[PDB]
Design a protein around this ligand. Structure first.
Ligand SMILES: *[C@@H]1O[C@H](CO)[C@@H](O[C@@H]2O[C@H](CO)[C@@H](O[C@@H]3O[C@H](CO)[C@@H](O)[C@H](O[C@H]4O[C@H](CO)[C@@H](O)[C@H](O)[C@@H]4O)[C@@H]3O)[C@H](O)[C@H]2NC(C)=O)[C@H](O)[C@H]1NC(C)=O
Ligand SMILES: *[C@@H]1O[C@H](CO)[C@@H](O[C@@H]2O[C@H](CO)[C@@H](O[C@@H]3O[C@H](CO)[C@@H](O)[C@H](O[C@H]4O[C@H](CO)[C@@H](O)[C@H](O)[C@@H]4O)[C@@H]3O)[C@H](O)[C@H]2NC(C)=O)[C@H](O)[C@H]1NC(C)=O
Ligand SMILES: *[C@@H]1O[C@H](CO)[C@@H](O[C@@H]2O[C@H](CO)[C@@H](O[C@@H]3O[C@H](CO)[C@@H](O)[C@H](O[C@H]4O[C@H](CO)[C@@H](O)[C@H](O)[C@@H]4O)[C@@H]3O)[C@H](O)[C@H]2NC(C)=O)[C@H](O)[C@H]1NC(C)=O
Ligand SMILES: CC(=O)N[C@H]1[C@H]([C@H](O)[C@H](O)CO)O[C@@](OC[C@H]2O[C@@H](O)[C@H](O)[C@@H](O)[C@H]2O)(C(=O)O)C[C@@H]1O
Ligand SMILES: CC(=O)N[C@H]1[C@H]([C@H](O)[C@H](O)CO)O[C@@](OC[C@H]2O[C@@H](O)[C@H](O)[C@@H](O)[C@H]2O)(C(=O)O)C[C@@H]1O
Ligand SMILES: *[C@@H]1O[C@H](CO)[C@@H](O[C@@H]2O[C@H](CO)[C@@H](O)[C@H](O)[C@H]2NC(C)=O)[C@H](O)[C@H]1NC(C)=O
Ligand SMILES: *[C@@H]1O[C@H](CO)[C@@H](O[C@@H]2O[C@H](CO)[C@@H](O)[C@H](O)[C@H]2NC(C)=O)[C@H](O)[C@H]1NC(C)=O
Ligand SMILES: *[C@@H]1O[C@H](CO)[C@@H](O)[C@H](O)[C@H]1NC(C)=O
Ligand SMILES: *[C@@H]1O[C@H](CO)[C@@H](O)[C@H](O)[C@H]1NC(C)=O
Ligand SMILES: *[C@@H]1O[C@H](CO)[C@@H](O)[C@H](O)[C@H]1NC(C)=O
Ligand SMILES: *[C@@H]1O[C@H](CO)[C@@H](O)[C@H](O)[C@H]1NC(C)=O
Ligand SMILES: *[C@@H]1O[C@H](CO)[C@@H](O)[C@H](O)[C@H]1NC(C)=O
Ligand SMILES: *[C@@H]1O[C@H](CO)[C@@H](O)[C@H](O)[C@H]1NC(C)=O
Ligand SMILES: *[C@@H]1O[C@H](CO)[C@@H](O)[C@H](O)[C@H]1NC(C)=O
Ligand SMILES: *[C@@H]1O[C@H](CO)[C@@H](O)[C@H](O)[C@H]1NC(C)=O
Ligand SMILES: *[C@@H]1O[C@H](CO)[C@@H](O)[C@H](O)[C@H]1NC(C)=O
Lengths: 318, 172, 172, 318, 172, 318
């Protein structure tokens, strides 16, 4: 006689729990994960040019530590510094180390162009037993340890023009003898001095004498400084003792290059996002892997799971 | 939900329903049956899918940034570098927490609304030939075989053909 | 409000109803009365309470941070320290402003949705024995005594018992 | 025959004003405050170990200013510096005061361990009228003013290994005489020099002679420096004049310790959150008291009041 | 829209309507007409205008801040200055994106709700004299000339006056 | 017999696309722009007291570079530095240039108050051809180049008390000769020294001899420093050579002053918000002109357009 038509919606056996504005816990038929919680443990090899420092920090590669000679003129979109890297050269110290490591990392190039420096009156290519290059005593590759020649040390005054359209990164330094005897013995003058200036700046640094803890057999140390010379400017280096001479310049460039500290193996895959814990998918809005990232990466947030509802509410069925 | 359809005036859900999110179930001279409403279901799915895509296909690139882990104690400058990243992190963690909260609350009302729409769409079709029993079912006051029910589900139901038969049953 | 019940088709609220958020008032042969709907009221409160609890049981621990007040002038570094804090502050103030704004709007519409749900719930119970006068009132077309009115409020009412009497009164 | 049943919602006399998306001003039956805007005006003595600097600044406490010796080996979850704190010792300067005050604050401990440095050739425990430890002259408890002995002042060279499993914070300094007569009179040499180094950090300071405004009667100033020696390393101090020697080191710890500037009395109560204006409850999401906070604390916001609606809209009857 | 009125059970809009947001359209004995509902239209307009004003009359002042462009490479300190500004910029960009998204979604549902409110306000007025045809139109079962229709639009329509005439047409 | 009443809503010919939570593209009858994306290209001369550097950097104006003397004692709500500004006085260098440019810019005034010199024993008003003052050899207006007097450079020791109620900004310098001959010839002592202190601070700078790239014919340079003297304190300058003396001080005020780099013309109009691209209206919540801004300005955002819906959904008609 009469018919009975009923309307309804579906439901699932085991649904998914989600958070709303009125439930930190309510159940839906289906949800999707907004937070990337897991990493592969490995760093993909490539949308990005990856350079594994191996046993070298970016700096030591920049200075030319003998074992870091392989990184000579190398480039990188992302340099990878390892936890077990070490230094096997002369004891050094860099005021504002972080900034140098940062600007070179950002530049992403170690292209060292050797210039024709004019060191008249001294002995070049200085070295030590703390930086062996094979059986012999060596020194940093991009540096020139100058010492006395024929019983004198000249008031050096050398000029080096940037007749190019790009910026030059000059990296030099001064040497800190362990004793006065060493000072006069190496540079003749009881007190040394290094002044490296451009029409835009100057950095007049004075050697410091005294005993420091033996590092690889050396009480002394080398402090390290840097200078940028803009196109149309000239570099003037004026020192009558204790100068660790440049051998040229590094070509500076702008891009997306950077540096990361990670022990994560480098694998052959393809992943936009890079974290110290490995590469990770960027299909999710957020991530809880590491706040350190590089490339196309999810915003790091503290929550480990964030469910976006993709189905109605789940209501059982009797 | 704001509409009181799902988890409201519709007691339960149908785990038997596997072809759609919404649908009809009948009983008539010929027996019972079940069919999913494609139009309705797709409307919800299409909306929710757009909602999702506004949140997944999107991430921005950041290369050279600031350090965030330190091996030595420095003081003022490092404090700032940490405060900055920490500040950044809380703000985003809050955004993520609020987005899903909002999204999910709106997703539950939308699915509920789409269920209510189908109910109203059905009530209006039946006109004076049926009555709402209060549980999401309509009592159609006239012999309505499989074909008759199908015309309702496909939206071609002609209320006049049964008005008289129905009016008699309803008011007798 | 999206549902147009509160501050809508229901002219105004009752300061007299001190036992709930929702209720009925009736005028029958035996008199005029007023009960408050518990089920309905409880449902509004449970939702607003969970809504509140999400916003107030949460704070984050922060110990050593950056400085924020300076006794002397310094320059670059200090500027950054202030911008950072000032920036952070504006963003949370925005979050706070937005939070309540959103929340309050959903809160007003939820109370409206709950009122409406009770009304549709009630209308579906009465079936053909009553009509919606449009002022939030159903004109029940039969003699509905305090027992009949109670059966409607606690949801036991059988439309079949008063059906005939009502139709007689309605279509006459 | 008929019956009439009307449905309704309640309302209240004195409603509450709240803000929405479509109204900045609209009335609801009830709402709750989200912005902790008030104080007790006092800092609770608990949960956090609180330490009132009193008249002593964390620094002076660290250095060992006489009236700050009660603070010897002190610890604190939260150190509290007062506005009337004064320095009653020898004029001092600290290049990068803010960072020292900071790292020390975060370590939250003043545990000092006296080390057996051996200063051969000099006169120790030197003092000043500007360091009246009691009626007589004196000096910072943790420092050792060194002076010539029997008309000379050695090229000092003392080593101190870090054979412990933790980091040591050594704080030393150099003296800047008011005149040359003073320089040669105290340290014989016409020009002093201080060099403190590890296998990782080397810093060398040169005394600089001149007249500076009198403070507690002294034109001369002492500049203070610090040096962290990591486990497995070693400290080497080399100087032939003007060195203010270390007496040992400070244990360095990591935790939730910090410092705060206030004048807020310290009562006996329990408040998780602390602010310069005193402690304040943390049951509300936001607060307008002070942006400076310590502990589980509501985020500071500019808004002084934000009401969360907790009831329907209020529509009275006339 | 959550209410399924606009772009829902109401096929489409009226481009002929230029003096209102919502209105009626008839076809009585006297022909056909069209009039905009001021009450309804204004309600939507008033709400959306408030909505807008909460977002436009507002901007804060910032004078001395931090540099944001640099002529030389510096390192650590500069990185932080850029990270801070960039972090700030993304957070606000996110806020803006989310504001319009939420606002707009709510604006579309609100306008849709106001349409439905008008429909319901009408249905209740007509009582038992009309029937919802399912397309936003009511079939009034009684001779309703221009005056009769006008009373409906101005809300003074007296359902009793036509109930009998109407009930006869409806159930015959 | 029967009538038909239809309820509807309007639609428009050409609507507007907007973004929601469920659509990145949906058409509504009307919307409004929230992102200010265009500039007039000019900086409105006001609410804000604007000052065009024209060819003077705020610093050069502060120092007193001859062509910048027109800025003497100028004030500003917003200083505008032009990209074609140049320096034509004596070659100088400022450690922490950024900071000085910042604190002065923030002060918003160049009010200079000459104070009683007390240079007994030296020759004042030294000058250079590199800083031509008309036909003559000049120098920064606010600095006093001191040199030997009658074969001798005294051990300078001058005091200047701060008896006022505001902080004084003293800016002095030290000169770096190009050679030893110059050193002794100009200051007699073979090594100069400048020590400027207060009861609260003390900075001692040592000159450094050497050759630097010629700038307007000079190989030498001037390093510039500054000191703030608080009320109740006093300034003491002690030097026996190479000091470039202050001539007084700059009044230091706090406010809403600031500086900006822009080549935008300064037209006559009224605009609360200023950007390097020019002024912009602040009626919109967001802007995409420039992240650099001064005044009441919309927040900068990456998006070049954000539409706020202001009407219902637009549904056409077949
Ligand atoms: C100032 O103090 C420093 C630190 O105390 C001091 O440096 C020390 O110098 C001695 C050498 O004079 C170093 O001793 C060496 O240690 C290594 C350990 O790996 C040895 O291999 C070296 O062997 C030499 O001596 C042997 C005698 O047993 C010979 O067999 C051998 O062939 C070598 O000639 C040597 O023992 C000591 O390591 C440093 N300490 C540190 C941490 O630097 C310095 O001498 C003092 N300054 C002055 C100038 O007095
Ligand atoms: C470089 O210039 C500075 C600044 O002028 C100069 O320092 C000044 O030194 C004088 C001493 O030559 C200081 O004078 C002292 O003033 C205080 C006042 O509070 C007094 O305590 C001292 O008392 C003396 O006189 C009393 C008179 O009865 C005696 O009872 C007592 O025993 C003392 O003899 C003394 O007068 C002056 O305070 C400082 N000024 C500042 C601000 O530093 C410095 O000496 C000059 N360089 C040199 C050494 O040429
Ligand atoms: C250390 O090295 C530096 C850099 O090489 C060096 O500085 C140079 O000094 C020379 C002379 O000492 C400068 O030469 C001058 O160059 C300018 C051109 O820009 C000319 O105006 C000068 O004029 C000469 O020729 C004119 C002919 O028209 C004559 O009218 C006039 O009288 C002069 O004869 C002159 O040639 C040169 O500018 C600098 N270069 C740099 C890079 O600064 C310095 O000499 C070396 N140190 C020492 C002191 O040994
Ligand atoms: C450029 C130079 O002089 N190289 C020296 C080097 C340096 O003097 C040293 O690095 C300065 O710190 O010294 C080298 O030997 C060190 C060795 O010298 C002996 O004469 C002495 O008897 C030893 O105690 C020890 O100091 C070195 O290898 O570093 C030699 C090198 O030629
Ligand atoms: C205060 C003073 O002595 N001013 C001198 C100035 C300074 O000595 C110089 O700036 C120190 O760096 O030197 C001036 O001269 C350049 C001039 O020097 C001669 O001795 C030389 O014979 C000339 O060829 C030429 O180099 C200067 O203008 O800077 C003169 C000034 O009086
Ligand atoms: C503002 O700058 C003017 C210089 O233009 C200052 O005027 C000098 O005042 C001193 C006395 O303090 C006179 O000896 C000079 O002759 C004045 N300079 C000349 C010749 O114009 C004025 O003192 C400064 N005051 C402000 C407004 O800070
Ligand atoms: C406003 O001025 C800026 C200059 O500060 C214009 O220049 C842009 O600068 C950014 C640097 O953050 C570069 O990435 C772009 O390449 C520059 N844009 C272009 C194409 O010149 C900026 O474009 C100006 N904006 C407006 C609204 O004119
Ligand atoms: C939810 O489960 C369904 C099954 O119908 C699947 O198609 C969908 O991908 C899941 N949700 C999403 C949007 O990921
Ligand atoms: C990199 O080093 C090589 C030698 O290995 C040198 O010839 C080359 O110039 C360097 N890079 C360049 C191209 O500047
Ligand atoms: C609807 O059902 C009727 C009867 O079963 C059938 O004739 C008609 O073709 C159906 N329409 C559609 C489009 O499914
Ligand atoms: C409803 O009210 C009627 C009359 O008061 C009563 O008999 C019935 O038991 C009630 N039902 C319930 C469960 O409240
Ligand atoms: C309810 O509303 C009034 C106004 O918001 C408010 O002050 C009161 O505190 C609220 N009730 C409580 C105590 O939570
Ligand atoms: C300070 O504490 C250390 C323990 O860390 C202890 O060895 C030393 O004796 C204490 N000094 C005093 C003043 O008690
Ligand atoms: C809190 O302390 C600050 C100073 O740090 C003071 O300026 C402010 O007015 C105080 N406000 C309160 C919350 O009492
Ligand atoms: C409503 O319409 C009726 C019929 O046209 C008219 O008589 C009445 O005055 C109208 N009411 C108003 C005030 O609009
Ligand atoms: C869109 O709305 C704005 C304000 O909300 C109004 O000024 C504008 O005229 C509207 N669009 C048009 C041109 O109708």
């Amino acid at each position: 006689s009469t018919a009975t038509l009923c309307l309804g919606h579906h439901a699932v056996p085991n649904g998914t729990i989600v958070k709303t504005i009125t439930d930190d816990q309510i159940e839906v038929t289906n949800a999707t994960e907004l937070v990337q919680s897991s990493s592969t443990g490995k760093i993909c090899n490539n949308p990005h040019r990856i350079l594994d420092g191996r046993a070298c920090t970016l700096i030591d590669a920049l200075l030319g530590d003998p074992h870091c000679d392989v990184f000579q003129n190398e480039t990188w979109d992302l340099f990878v510094e390892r936890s077990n890297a070490f230094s096997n050269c002369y004891p050094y110290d860099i005021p504002d180390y972080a900034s140098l490591r940062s600007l070179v990392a950002s530049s992403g190039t170690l292209e060292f162009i050797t210039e024709g420096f004019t060191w008249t009156g001294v002995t070049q290519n200085g070295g030590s037993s703390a930086c062996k290059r094979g059986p012999a005593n060596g020194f940093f590759s991009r540096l020139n340890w100058l010492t006395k020649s024929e019983s004198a040390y000249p008031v050096l005054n050398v000029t080096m023009p940037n007749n190019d359209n790009f910026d030059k990164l000059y990296i030099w330094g001064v040497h800190h003898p362990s004793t006065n005897q060493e000072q006069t013995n190496l540079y003749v003058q009881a007190s040394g001095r290094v002044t490296v200036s451009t029409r835009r700046s100057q950095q007049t640094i004075i050697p410091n004498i005294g005993s420091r803890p033996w590092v690889r057999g050396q009480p002394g140390r080398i402090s390290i400084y840097w200078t940028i010379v803009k196109p149309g400017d000239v570099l003037v280096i004026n020192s009558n003792g204790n100068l660790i001479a440049p051998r040229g310049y590094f070509k500076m460039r702008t891009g997306k290059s950077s540096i990361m500290r990670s022990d994560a193996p480098i694998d052959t895959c393809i992943s936009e996002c890079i974290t110290p814990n490995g590469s990770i998918p960027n299909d999710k809005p957020f991530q809880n892997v590491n706040k350190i990232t590089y490339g196309a990466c999810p915003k790091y947030v503290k929550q480990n799971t964030l469910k976006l509802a993709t189905g109605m509410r789940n209501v059982p069925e009797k | 939900g704001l509409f009181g359809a799902i988890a409201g005036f519709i007691e339960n859900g149908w785990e038997g329903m596997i072809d759609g999110w919404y649908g009809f179930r009948h009983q008539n001279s010929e027996g019972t049956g079940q069919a999913a409403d494609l139009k309705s279901t797709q409307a919800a799915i299409d909306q929710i899918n757009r909602k999702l895509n506004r949140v997944i296909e999107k991430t921005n690139e950041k290369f050279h940034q600031i350090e965030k882990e330190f091996s030595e104690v420095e003081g003022r400058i490092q404090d700032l570098e940490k405060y900055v990243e920490d500040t950044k992190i809380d703000l985003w963690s809050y955004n993520a927490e609020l987005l899903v909260a909002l999204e999910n609350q709106h997703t539950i009302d939308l699915a509920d609304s789409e269920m209510n729409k189908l109910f109203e769409k059905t009530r209006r079709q039946l006109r004076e030939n049926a009555e709402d029993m209060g549980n999401g079912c309509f009592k159609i006051y006239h012999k309505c075989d499989n074909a008759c029910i199908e015309s309702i589900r496909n939206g071609t139901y002609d209320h006049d053909i049964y008005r008289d038969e129905a009016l008699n049953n309803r008011f007798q």
